């Protein structure tokens, strides 16, 4: 195929000017979309607190309004999804992935208004769920919307404007431009065949999206953890132990969400009334736990710098980790709209911290900061549950800016991906799409 | 498809364990080797340094002993590549890209020794060529070698172990693990068809190689500038104008590296004696420039921090660029083993610093520091001429640790890879492979 190759080489990277200008406009929208989505999730969580104060004397009443405020806002989001766009429950990354395999439809006239307001209901109640779930899905559909609107043709701009939407979709949820671009390339793109995703466009999408997010969010960082110690060569072997620890736990977690989807599906059987009622109960718990023990609830971004600074006991770190596994499963297996990405950062941090602590006290010739081991294990559950290790590495890099730790961070992950492969683990996203395509053909 | 897809998904990321255990061994060997190349290269620059001592008095004698010291090491490399391995002259990355396509020969019994000692002559004699040309080539040839040694079969194992070796080999030339994997992904893979290259194995590959470098190269960084200032939002538009200047100069430089490959060839016309002799006048000139203007010769890393900290004048920058533009061509268009990747980092840093200095005197109200435009322009030639911005950006970020500039950096990189497209430039590593397959059926 020599002459075929020579001609194609001479013709590489000539994305059509129309596609690059549309990545610019998909980006900008996905940005404003996510910025608005974040600003919203905040204003609700605030009004939630302000009610606990109008009622701060009657401590039983206190726990009452904490439960019902979140139960109400949860049910709203549960209802809005199956009363409207169903494929908008849970993460939505499985679907946008599917939509790049051409197996799942981008119902943007429905998903746009169901994910965004349904998300605001679950997230804005303080459920254990990330912004990236909605923003990624919403961003893709926004890419589709501008596709159907401007009627562009070809597989290049369909898959491209689909990608740069969900890329800009994930940039804007972590102010992590590089992690967005990479998410497409490692995890999101169609994994069994070649593709026409114009990467240069995905960038213009990510750029414009991140610039919008900087416009509304600068001078404060999502996670400030400051500069921690370095890692001596003789220490690396402890991070390659940590990966193994995550490599065997990553898949065990995958099984639960699946088995928990099932075990929670048997609660409502499909009935929109039992299901919504159930979601209000979950959300109410999360609003209560958010008052009575905030580490077991919410998005987890708040307790990450606390865990790193060695400011949590081992007793606590275990407690936090048990409960936040419990409330993560209740929140994402039940299918409430929102990602199980950003809570998977926390669970890993709360683990690396626990290991750093035992690693500090067993080897003082090493002179350990327990916080290096949380930063390794932040993107560790990502490598061993969803098996996109290169993206959790550049994500963690971008949020925390401790580049020195590059080796134990890439060493731990390889540890986690490889033991997860070797202990029969399936990538959490694609394990969901299959159960979804097997359900879209197991009724005939 | 859906049934196929349901079956293919439920069976994803399951690289053969043998492919994995063997990837760890490739990087181990691509690492020890890679380190060995760099220890050699300095050790001879040392001799050139330590020989300029014994004859430091007859100022004409000194000029020429630095000429001849490097003139001699210059020629030794031109020969060891013509005599025993012709595909090992120059970069070698085109070649490894070629091999993955199944379109070129992996002669490891021949290239590993030719490149290793060949480049020591052009790198240790003071030439304008990075350690990256040899290290990635050697790294893959090493990867082929253990696929032959252990006799594993298939397209997957041949493409994985050829690839990781090229990644574990670009890391170990820049202490750049991420930009190692991201080179495979963004630039070196078969770019028009799917491949079975296992990333999880291309990753293990770079862990082991990186570890080998940190064991010999630790507590000393290759470019150290510290923490520069942040970049306001109202200033980001300047980083686009920078990227546009790179976007138009990106191609024009590509003309010059291809065109001059043709014209240095007319000098010799394929005569191994007319050619080695021409390249020891190049190398003799480069050991002699590395004494009068250490900034206009050598890898170029030395001037980058001096460049970034605004320590040059506007004139000296103007000079240093025109000079390095020149001294870069002559060294790689002559086909002497060693990359153009690194001497472009230098070219870019120099360029942006010139751009910042303008900015600083035009906008006192932005309170600018020209070094941020250096860091933006450092990977800018890489984005604009070999057209790999994602790897270029992540490379510079891995070597300068100025992540608060990640936005102005991505904006200059896109601003180059875009305007190179709208004018007339091509990925140089696939314009080489193009012209080199254009004579393999001519």
């Amino acid at each position: 195929r020599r002459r075929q190759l020579i001609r194609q080489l001479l013709e590489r990277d000539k994305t059509p000017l129309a596609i690059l200008f549309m990545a610019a406009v998909v980006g900008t929208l996905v940005g404003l979309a996510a910025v608005a989505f974040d600003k919203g999730v905040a204003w609700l969580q605030n009004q939630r607190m302000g009610a606990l104060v109008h009622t701060a004397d009657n401590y039983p009443l206190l726990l009452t309004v904490a439960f019902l405020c979140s139960a109400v806002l949860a049910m709203f989001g549960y209802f809005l999804v199956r009363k409207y766009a169903p494929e908008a429950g849970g993460s939505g990354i499985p679907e946008i992935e599917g939509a790049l395999e051409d197996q799942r439809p981008v119902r943007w006239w429905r998903v746009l208004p169901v994910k965004f307001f349904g998300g605001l209901g679950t997230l804005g109640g303080g459920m254990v769920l990330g912004r990236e779930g909605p923003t990624v899905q919403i961003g893709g559909n926004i890419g589709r919307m501008v596709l159907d609107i401007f009627r562009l043709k070809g597989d290049e701009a369909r898959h491209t404007l689909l990608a740069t939407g969900a890329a800009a979709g994930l940039a804007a949820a972590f102010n992590a431009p590089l992690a967005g671009i990479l998410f497409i390339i490692e995890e999101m793109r169609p994994q069994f065949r070649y593709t026409l995703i114009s990467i240069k466009a995905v960038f213009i999408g990510v750029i414009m999206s991140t610039i919008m997010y900087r416009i509304f969010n600068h001078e404060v960082a999502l996670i400030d953890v400051g500069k921690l110690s370095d890692a001596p060569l003789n220490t690396l072997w402890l991070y390659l132990i940590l990966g193994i620890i995550f490599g065997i736990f990553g898949p065990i977690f995958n099984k639960w969400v699946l088995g928990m989807q099932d075990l929670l599906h048997r609660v409502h059987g499909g009935n929109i009334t039992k299901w919504v009622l159930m979601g209000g109960a979950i959300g109410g718990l999360c609003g209560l736990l958010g008052f009575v023990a905030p580490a077991t609830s919410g998005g987890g971004f708040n307790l990450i710098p606390i865990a790193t600074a060695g400011n949590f006991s081992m007793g606590m770190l275990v407690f936090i980790f048990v409960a936040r596994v419990i409330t993560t499963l209740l929140c994402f297996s039940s299918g409430a709209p929102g990602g199980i990405f950003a809570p998977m950062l926390a669970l890993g941090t709360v683990l690396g911290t626990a290991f750093g602590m035992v690693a500090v006290e067993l080897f003082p010739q090493y002179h350990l900061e327990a916080g290096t081991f949380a930063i390794a294990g932040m993107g560790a559950l990502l490598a061993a549950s969803i098996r996109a290790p290169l993206t959790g590495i550049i994500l963690v890099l971008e949020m925390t800016d401790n580049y020195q730790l590059i080796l134990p961070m890439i060493i731990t992950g390889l540890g986690a991906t490889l033991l997860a492969q070797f202990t029969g683990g399936k990538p959490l996203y694609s394990a969901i799409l299959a159960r979804t395509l097997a359900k879209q053909e197991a009724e005939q | 498809r859906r049934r196929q897809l349901i079956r293919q998904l439920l069976e994803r990321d399951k690289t053969p364990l043998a492919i994995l255990f063997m990837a760890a061994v490739v990087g181990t060997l691509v690492g020890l080797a890679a380190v060995a190349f760099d220890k050699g290269v300095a050790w001879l620059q040392n001799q050139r340094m330590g020989a300029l001592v014994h004859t430091a008095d007859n100022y004409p004698l000194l000029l020429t002993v630095a000429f001849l010291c490097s003139a001699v090491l210059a020629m030794f490399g031109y020969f060891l590549v013509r005599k025993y391995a012709p595909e090992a002259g120059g970069s070698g990355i085109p070649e490894i890209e070629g091999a993955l396509e199944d379109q070129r020969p992996v002669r490891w019994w021949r290239v590993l020794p030719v490149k290793f000692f060949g480049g020591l002559g052009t790198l240790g004699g003071g030439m304008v060529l990075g350690r990256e040309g040899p290290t990635v080539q050697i790294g893959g040839n090493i990867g082929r070698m253990v696929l032959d040694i252990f006799r594993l079969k298939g397209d997957e194992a041949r493409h994985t172990l050829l690839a990781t070796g090229a990644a574990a080999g670009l890391a170990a030339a820049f202490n750049a693990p991420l930009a190692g994997i991201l080179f495979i992904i963004e630039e070196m893979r078969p770019q028009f068809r799917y491949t079975l290259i296992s990333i999880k194995a291309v990753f293990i590959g770079v862990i082991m190689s990186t570890i080998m470098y940190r064991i010999f190269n630790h507590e000393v960084a290759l470019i150290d500038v510290g923490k520069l200032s942040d970049a306001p939002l109202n200033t980001l538009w300047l980083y686009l104008i920078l990227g546009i200047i790179f976007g138009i100069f990106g191609p024009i430089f590509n003309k010059w590296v291809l065109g001059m490959q043709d014209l240095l060839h007319r000098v010799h016309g394929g005569n191994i004696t007319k050619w080695v002799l021409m390249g020891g006048a190049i190398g003799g000139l480069c050991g002699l420039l590395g004494f009068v203007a250490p900034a206009t010769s050598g890898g170029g890393f030395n001037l980058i921090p001096i460049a970034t900290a605004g320590n040059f004048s506007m004139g000296m920058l103007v000079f240093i660029f025109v000079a390095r533009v020149i001294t870069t061509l002559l060294c790689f268009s002559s086909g002497a083993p060693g990359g153009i990747f690194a001497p472009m980092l230098a070219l870019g840093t120099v360029l942006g610093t010139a751009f910042g200095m303008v900015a600083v005197e035009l906008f006192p109200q932005y309170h600018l520091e020209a070094g941020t435009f250096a860091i933006a322009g450092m990977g800018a030639l890489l984005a604009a001429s070999i057209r790999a911005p994602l790897t270029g950006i992540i490379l510079v970020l891995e070597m300068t640790d100025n992540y608060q500039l990640i936005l102005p950096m991505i904006i200059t990189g896109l601003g180059a890879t875009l305007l190179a497209q709208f004018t007339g430039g091509k990925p140089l590593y696939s314009a080489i492979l193009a012209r080199t397959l254009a004579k393999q059926e001519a």
Partner: antibody
Amino acid sequence: EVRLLESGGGLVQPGGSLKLSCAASGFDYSRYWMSWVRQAPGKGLKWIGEINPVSSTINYTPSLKDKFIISRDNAKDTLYLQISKVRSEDTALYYCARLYYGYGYWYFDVWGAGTTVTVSS
Amino acid sequence: DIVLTQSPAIMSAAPGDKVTMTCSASSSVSYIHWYQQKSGTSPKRWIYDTSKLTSGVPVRFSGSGSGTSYSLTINTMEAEDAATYYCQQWSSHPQTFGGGTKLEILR
């Protein structure tokens, strides 16, 4: 230059107390573990203790508890050592060091000139 | 903990001459550091990791060894090399210095 300038060592009666002070100049005094190391006359070097930049883990040699107190005043760029219940055994030349590592087996990177502590009635 | 016992407690030798002292260990030890003390100066870190001359350390110096036994060595020593050479480990914890070795000129 990188300078450790320690002071505070003179005559003290037995069973007393003193506060050794090491003043740093030439580098970022945080980001570094600091360490004290004393040397009885005509004898070996002995390790007292160390303290990590955030004062969060302070380590001493197998010798009681209240005996030694290491603290650091990152703000003032100064490392402190309090010896309590001073014996004649504690009569020695007290060194101030800054800790680094190589392959991660740690070492005493830069020392200061010293101060002399004489314990006699 | 981990005792260090340096072997030629005092010693002399002429200039331009090969000198060799010895650190030893009650248990097993990895990567040992040497410091040079001249009477009245701060101990200078001399040698580390059991194989890493510090900056400015003249090349005539050297160190070798394994597990518990290691050793310093001067292939041709001038005068400035006369001082005291303290080995110290931090393979294990807590760390330990050795008693010393006084290097004196012979004349």
